[PDB]
């Protein structure tokens, strides 16, 4: 690796790993288009398995942007619009409030409040939901939403969430070894290098409605603070400070983007594992070409994820 990315990344990354008490990550930077991999401590921490480039890692949370993007994959092959509502692909959801409700706020978690975690006590819980807030006025981050979005999003694909996943997604992005088992995903480094040059640069991917499915995912459909949410992704304007990029449920106003502003490369794109208690984090910036994926198993604080993320890419910029 070119000094200035070892330097870079044994400067920010080994200072992290001890704060945090990490006991293993793999890290790539990804820099003019080329990935560049770095590993520290063990998969097995207990029976001392070190972490390697093809070490598999719950994704968590980052598992939504696959989501995100093969809903925009479907969006391409005239499958789904956002706008069609969610009573159009499960009827079964008979009630006052699912008219109404659209298939873009189950992606964006702008529904009127779906919670975080379906509680641990389906049909009977959506039915029963009722949202606190009108459709598209509040995001709260919420895998009963974003997941209910990726069940009815492949209903018109006939193929079942997991093959959709693997054929349209997986394989034309040649990750081999990236797994989803439903009845979200895991990865490696080297998977999850290919993802976010990808998600970098759509324009290099051959297949015309993945391609289009990446740019859409990163569409901007929301406006709160600094932020905009993405489908999957979230972004800000680049550049940006560490502060203004960064403890349980935030239900935030937000401002609609009529319409949804297409891809804006000057952006800071990111995910974080960190909502779900997951050690994985996700961001780039288009236009740099640059980007960055840290995994790792212990749910360290997502604040020192954006830190040494920043910290990286900054310097490489």
Known sequence: ???????????????????????????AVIYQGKPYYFTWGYADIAKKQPVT??????????????????????????????SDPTTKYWPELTAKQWNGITLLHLATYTAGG??????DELLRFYQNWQPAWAPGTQRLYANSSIGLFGALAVKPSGLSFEQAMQTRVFQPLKLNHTWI?????????????????????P??????????????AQSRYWQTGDMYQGLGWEMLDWPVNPDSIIIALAARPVKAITPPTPAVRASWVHK????????????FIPEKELGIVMLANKNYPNPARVDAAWQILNALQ
């Open 1 to 27: 690796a070119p000094q200035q990315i070892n330097d870079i990344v044994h400067r920010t990354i080994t200072p992290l790993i001890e704060q945090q008490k990490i006991p293993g990550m793999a890290v």
């Open 53 to 82: 480039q093809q070490t598999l890692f719950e994704l968590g949370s980052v598992s939504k942007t696959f989501i995100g993007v093969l809903g925009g994959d479907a969006i391409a092959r005239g499958e789904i619009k956002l």
């Open 203 to 216: 324009l290099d991917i051959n297949e015309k409605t993945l391609q289009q499915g990446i740019q859409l």
């Open 181 to 201: 088992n439903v009845p979200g995903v895991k990865s490696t480094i080297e998977d999850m290098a290919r993802w976010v040059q990808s998600n970098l640069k």
């Open 272 to 283: 974080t594992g960190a909502t779900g208690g997951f050690g994985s984090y996700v961001a």
């Open 114 to 119: 779906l919670p975080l975690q379906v509680p």
